[PDB]
Design a protein around this ligand. Structure first.
Ligand code: 8VO
Ligand code: CPS
Length: 328
């Protein structure tokens, strides 16, 4: 009764899922991004080097293609893609719907991310008012069409060298989590953002904005908060890049603790260290980056979601959080 889309890990940094566009079931690999609200695929009309190795969309081969042609640009923090709108049947797992998406013809503004990774496009799982072109979210539409029970989706992320994951559309499956599932109300109309007190040792921010974001492969921290965290931490910044290197067993590395009236969520160093044995033996990179929003904000990205099963509920305007089962 729920639609389960398998998630594959890529080099323990990101994860992808597959979906199809067109009646001839043209296959694509997507970053699944709760932080955006547009779907895009690279077109056979693409003029840029990044498209060379990708699965490309051919509207001429799909009888369900409906021409739109309205020009559009998606400006992400990691770069820009541009093209034009198109409409065609989009199949996610065993559910399909006619859907407006962007045919991308220029990916040069999205380098070096695009050529360095094996995804074809991005599938947004955000809120309608964050989309360009007023596109109802896939999950909201599937519910509206009575193809699913609830307008919610869940993420059970894969774990490099242990198990695959699933994006489940339409209901919550017990098999993904253990202990209590705690619901945190959205504090914004159109982001998967919740209020949590943030504690890292003696450093804390009360009632911080926390964005649960599937497309961000880091925990992001306010820059002042990070600078305090790093003081006498025996960590070294990489020349020219906002990444920090540490001995993996550095006994100073702290545990993030995020609390609500409802729940307590922790993130120990094992969840935010990336081994980099190639650069040096016993060295790790912190998957933590400094980033200032206008209101002090943390992004609870991939590292958080690897530990915690997450439920994104449109109807109840909340994020549900529970400890992910280590095995299925
Ligand atoms: C609707 S869309 C426009 C939106 N712009 C904005 O709000 C403009 C904005 C607003 C506030 C700030 N203070 C800065 C920019 C936007 O881009 N939002 C993204 C989420 C976000 C939002 C805000 C900051 C950072 C990230 C999007 O949801 C997302 O996750 N992206 C873009 S493309 C992408 C590859 C799927 C992924 C990405 O860049 N990941 C990289 C990444 C990112 C930060 C730290 C390490 C890493 C490594 C790697 O994982
Ligand atoms: C989102 C933040 C902050 C960016 C910011 O907003 N900085 C300047 C102002 C923005 N504008 C230029 C749009 C405004 C106009 C200038 S003005 O002076 O008027 O403000 C920027 C700063 C450093 C950026 C990361 C690093 O690169 C490394 C890496 C490179 C890959 O490729 C993509 C992934 C990654 C992780 C990057 C993601 C993201 O991208 C970061 C976090």
């Amino acid at each position: 009764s729920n639609d389960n889309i398998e998630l594959v890990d890529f080099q323990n940094i990101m994860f992808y899922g597959d979906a199809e566009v067109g009646d001839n079931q043209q296959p694509f690999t997507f970053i699944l991004d709760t932080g955006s609200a547009n779907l895009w695929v690279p077109s056979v009309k693409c003029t840029t080097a990044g498209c060379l190795t990708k699965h490309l969309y051919d509207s001429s081969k799909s009888r369900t293609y409906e021409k739109d042609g309205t020009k559009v640009e998606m400006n992400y923090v990691s770069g820009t893609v541009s093209g034009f709108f198109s409409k065609d049947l989009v199949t996610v797992g065993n559910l399909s719907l006619p859907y407006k998406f962007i045919e991308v013809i220029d990916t040069n503004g999205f380098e070096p991310t695009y050529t360095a990774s094996t995804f074809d496009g991005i599938l947004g799982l955000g809120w309608k008012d964050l989309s360009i072109g007023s596109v109802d979210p896939i999950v909201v539409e599937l519910k509206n069409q009575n193809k699913i029970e609830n307008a919610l989706f869940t993420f059970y992320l894969p774990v490099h060298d242990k198990h695959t994951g699933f994006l489940t559309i339409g209901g919550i499956e017990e098999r993904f989590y253990e202990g209590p599932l705690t619901y945190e109300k959205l504090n914004h109309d159109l982001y998967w953002q919740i209020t949590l007190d943030a504690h890292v040792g003696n450093i804390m921010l009360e009632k911080a904005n926390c964005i649960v974001d599937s497309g961000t492969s880091a925990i992001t921290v306010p820059t002042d908060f990070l600078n305090k965290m790093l003081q006498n931490l025996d960590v070294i910044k990489v020349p020219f890049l906002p990444f920090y290197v540490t001995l993996c067993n550095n006994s100073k590395l702290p545990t993030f603790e995020f609390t609500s009236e409802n729940g307590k969520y922790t993130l120990e160093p094992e969840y935010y260290l990336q081994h980099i044995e190639d650069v040096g033996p016993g060295l790790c990179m912190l998957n933590i980056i400094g980033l200032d929003f206008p209101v002090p904000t943390f992004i609870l990205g991939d590292p958080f979601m690897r530990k915690y099963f997450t439920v994104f509920d449109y109807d109840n305007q909340s994020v549900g959080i529970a400890l992910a089962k280590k095995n299925l």
